[PDB]
């Protein structure tokens, strides 16, 4: 029983953790990295705790670049590297490369196998229908040494764990051919058409991130005309060039006019509230992450779903799959993730290795940074995630996701940190300085009033700059932002043009006075992003003199 496995693992947290670390060290304690730490082959917890330092990405990057450039000696593991999983987190504007090994796919597959067993406890009958999940592959590259680098889900979807899988609780409408198609449009359109045809078997709707599902809905808003047509005519549109997709959908696309009729009846109305249960009326819930930065999207999802529950099922990363939500139907505000003690060796830094707290021993109410040791040879690596213990499941702590440290803005997988944002502001002022203008202060917000959302930067200038020049400032900020952002702009369409709102002189002084109604004066520092979803965003907006948008896409190529 998957459920009994969860109960055993969480009952025996600290014993499992010891055994896992023994397995990892049995595998790796003889690698270059651990030998350099002086472990000298020890596989026991006391030796490890004593000798292995806590590290960040930049401490490991020298080892990673050696592997990327073709070093195939056992640097990090006696299981050598199979590919690089590209985190959406960056350093110097480039994606961090998380080495993985072939063995880890099986542990990822184990975590996935736990999800529907838990869900089935709260939502009956899912086996009697399909899931409409919009899933997408993104671009791959190769390192100078020949290894592939690509996102974990892209790796997942192109793996046979996924392609040739044995299961009624995983009956999906999307043909893997459409999932694997490069082009966002063809992939989206083809998956929409298959979701609509099968509209009535659809018991749940989803995508990895809430924003992905929102972009699927916007896609419908823009293409239901041709969609209703191909449904009626039963003929695949020739916008779809990709021959492998055409063959997958045309394999289930049946001519159906009673179907096409309704699609027009619901999408012709200008009102799209509850559109999801109107097109897919047996939908029981939405399977999308809406914790952390995706929380922004909850109101928008509710409007389109008509109030359907939103399941946040899993907590995972490019470097390590962590665990799962044992209460997937709770309220989004109530989500906590139970880290699974078999997935790696997990330690916690209260927000140096002597302060590390073991998984079993974290304290309810406290916030910690996640520090992980993995089979792939990450050793006391800091993920950057801040977590708050909300309680315990048997001996296993449960965590509310707080944030990834230093991340200011995300629309999707982009994770723009304060350093990149500040440098972006500095690069755009080359357009301002000839006017005699400079940016006295700025802040930002992720704006999701439309799909896709976009970055809004507030500028208080000191000197007038014309509107075309300020729009070019938007573009320049985008050129300076990281590869994930620009890729999302040019390739995915998941982020719309960046917006600069110029605020009147004295605006940030006011922003100070409003927070001071609370905050400590000689403790205040201007927030570089604002989320207090009404009061502070409303105050800034109320001081805006003009608004400007990037008139063109930034540069990006894989």
Q: Could you say which residues in the range 33-52 bind ligand AMP, by CB under 6 A?
A: none
CB of 337 to ligand AMP, least distance (A): 7
413 assigned ligand-binding residue: no
Residue 115 near residue 131, CB atoms below 8 Å: no
Please state, in angstroms and rounded to a whole number, the distance separating the CA atoms of residues 408 and 394.
35
Residue 453 near residue 496, CB atoms below 8 Å: yes
337 assigned ligand-binding residue: yes
Please state, in angstroms and rounded to a whole number, the distance separating the CA atoms of residues 39 and 33.
9
CB of 346 to ligand AMP, least distance (A): 13
> How many residues sit close enough to ligand AMP to count as binding (CB under 6 A)?
17
Per-residue x/- marks for ligand AMP, 289-328, CB under 6 A?
x-xx-------------------x-xxxxx----------
User: For 195-214, b where at least 16 C-beta lie within 10 A, e where not — what string?
Assistant: bbbbbeebbbbbbbbbbbbb
Strands (DSSP E) contained in 20-115 are: 83-91, 94-100
Among positions 77, 88, 186, 444, the unique one binding ligand AMP when judged by CB under 6 A: 88
Residues 6+ apart with CB under 8 A from 518: none
Among positions 404, 489, 529, 548, the unique one binding ligand AMP when judged by CB under 6 A: 404
Q: Could you say which residues in the range 67-86 bind ligand AMP, by CB under 6 A?
A: none
Q: Kindly tell me which of 190 and 298 has the beta carbon lying closer to ligand AMP.
A: 298
CB of 174 to ligand AMP, least distance (A): 20
CA angle 289, 293, 295 (to 5 degrees): 60
- Does position 448 interact with ligand AMP (CB under 6 A)? The reply is no
Residues 6+ apart with CB under 8 A from 303: 272, 273, 274
- Does position 87 interact with ligand AMP (CB under 6 A)? The reply is yes
315 assigned ligand-binding residue: yes
By three-state DSSP, how is residue 189 classified?
A: helix
Per-residue x/- marks for ligand AMP, 149-188, CB under 6 A?
---x------------------------------------
CB of 116 to ligand AMP, least distance (A): 17
165 assigned ligand-binding residue: no
Residue 285 near residue 311, CB atoms below 8 Å: yes
CB of 95 to ligand AMP, least distance (A): 8
CB of 159 to ligand AMP, least distance (A): 16
Q: Kindly tell me which of 202 and 314 has the beta carbon lying closer to ligand AMP.
A: 314
Q: How far is Cα of residue 358 from the mean position of the Cα atoms in its chain?
A: 26
Q: Kindly tell me which of 89 and 497 has the beta carbon lying closer to ligand AMP.
A: 89
Q: Kindly tell me which of 417 and 441 has the beta carbon lying closer to ligand AMP.
A: 417
- Does position 383 interact with ligand AMP (CB under 6 A)? The reply is yes
Q: Kindly tell me which of 16 and 316 has the beta carbon lying closer to ligand AMP.
A: 316
148-150 and 345-350 beta bridge pairing: unpaired
Q: How far is Cα of residue 535 from the mean position of the Cα atoms in its chain?
A: 27
Residue 320 near residue 234, CB atoms below 8 Å: no
Residue 369 near residue 346, CB atoms below 8 Å: no
Cβ neighbourhood burial of 18 (10 Å; 0-12, 13-18, 19+): middle
- Does position 385 interact with ligand AMP (CB under 6 A)? The reply is yes
316 assigned ligand-binding residue: yes
Shortest CA distance to 102 belongs to which of 155, 32, 180, 50? 155
Residue 143 near residue 69, CB atoms below 8 Å: yes
314 assigned ligand-binding residue: yes
CB of 410 to ligand AMP, least distance (A): 9
What are the structure tokens assigned to 555, written together? 């540069």
Q: Terminus-to-terminus CA distance in the chain, angstroms?
A: 43
Q: Kindly tell me which of 242 and 414 has the beta carbon lying closer to ligand AMP.
A: 414
CB of 517 to ligand AMP, least distance (A): 31
CB of 157 to ligand AMP, least distance (A): 14
Please state, in angstroms and rounded to a whole number, the distance separating the CA atoms of residues 208 and 189.
18
Positions touching ligand AMP (CB under 6 A) are: 87-88, 152, 289, 291-292, 312, 314-318, 383, 385, 401, 404, 413
Q: Which residues are annotated as a binding site?
A: 88, 314-318, 337, 385, 404
Residues making up the annotated binding site for AMP are 88, 314-318, 337, 385, 404
């Amino acid at each position: 029983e998957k459920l009994r496995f969860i109960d055993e693992m969480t009952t025996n947290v600290d014993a499992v953790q010891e055994r896992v670390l023994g397995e990892i060290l049995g595998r790796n304690a003889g690698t270059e990295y651990l030998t350099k730490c002086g472990l000298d082959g020890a596989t026991d917890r006391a030796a490890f705790r004593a000798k292995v330092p806590v590290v960040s990405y930049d401490d490991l990057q020298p080892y990673i670049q050696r592997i990327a450039n073709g070093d195939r000696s056992p640097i990090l593991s006696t299981h050598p590297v199979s590919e690089f999983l590209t985190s959406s987190g960056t350093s110097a504007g480039e994606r961090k490369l998380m080495p993985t090994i072939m063995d880890e796919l099986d542990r990822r597959q184990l975590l996935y196998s736990l999800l529907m067993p838990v869900m089935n406890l709260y939502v009956p009958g899912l086996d009697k229908g399909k899931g409409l999940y919009f899933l997408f592959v993104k671009s791959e590259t190769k390192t100078p040494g020949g290894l592939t680098a690509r996102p974990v889900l892209t790796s997942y979807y192109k793996s046979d764990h996924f392609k040739n899988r044995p299961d009624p609780y995983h009956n999906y409408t999307s043909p893997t051919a459409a999932i694997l198609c490069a082009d966002a449009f063809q992939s989206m359109y083809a998956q929409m058409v298959c979701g609509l045809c099968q509209r009535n078997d659809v018991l749940r709707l989803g995508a990895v991130f809430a924003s992905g599902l929102l972009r699927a809905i916007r896609f419908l808003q823009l293409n239901w005309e041709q969609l209703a047509d191909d449904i009626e005519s039963g003929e695949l549109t020739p916008r779809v060039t990709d021959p492998s997709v055409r063959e997958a959908v045309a394999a289930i696309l049946l001519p159906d006019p009673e179907l096409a009729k309704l699609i027009r009846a619901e999408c012709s109305k200008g009102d799209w509230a509850g559109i999801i249960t109107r097109v897919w009326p047996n939908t029981k819930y939405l399977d999308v992450i809406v914790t952390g930065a995706m929380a922004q999207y909850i109101p928008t999802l509710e409007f389109y779903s008509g109030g359907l529950p939103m399941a946040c099922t899993m907590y995972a990363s490019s470097e390590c799959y962590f665990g799962l939500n044992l209460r997937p139907m709770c309220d989004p505000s109530e989500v906590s993730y139970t880290i699974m003690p078999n997935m790696g060796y997990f330690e916690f830094l209260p927000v140096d290795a002597t302060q590390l707290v073991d998984l079993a021993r974290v304290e309810v109410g406290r916030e910690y940074e996640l520090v992980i040791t993995t089979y792939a040879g990450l050793n006391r690596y800091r993920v950057g995630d801040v977590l708050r213990v909300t309680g315990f499941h048997n001996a296993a702590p449960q965590f509310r996701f707080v944030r990834r440290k230093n991340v200011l803005l995300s629309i999707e997988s982009d994770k723009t940190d304060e350093a990149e944002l500040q440098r972006a502001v500095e690069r755009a002022s080359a357009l301002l300085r000839p006017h005699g203008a400079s940016v006295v202060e700025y802040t930002s917000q992720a704006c999701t009033k439309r799909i896709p959302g976009h970055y809004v930067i507030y500028w208080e200038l000191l000197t007038v700059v014309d509107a075309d020049t300020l729009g070019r400032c938007c573009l320049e900020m985008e050129e300076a932002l990281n590869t994930v952002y620009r890729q999302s702009r040019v390739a995915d369409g998941s982020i719309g043009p960046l917006e600069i709102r110029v605020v009147r002189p004295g605006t940030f002084e006011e922003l100070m006075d409003y927070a001071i109604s609370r905050g400590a004066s000689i403790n205040q520092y201007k927030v570089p992003r604002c989320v207090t979803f009404p009061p502070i965003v409303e105050l800034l907006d109320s001081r805006v003199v003009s608004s400007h948008f990037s008139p063109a896409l930034p540069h990006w190529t894989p």
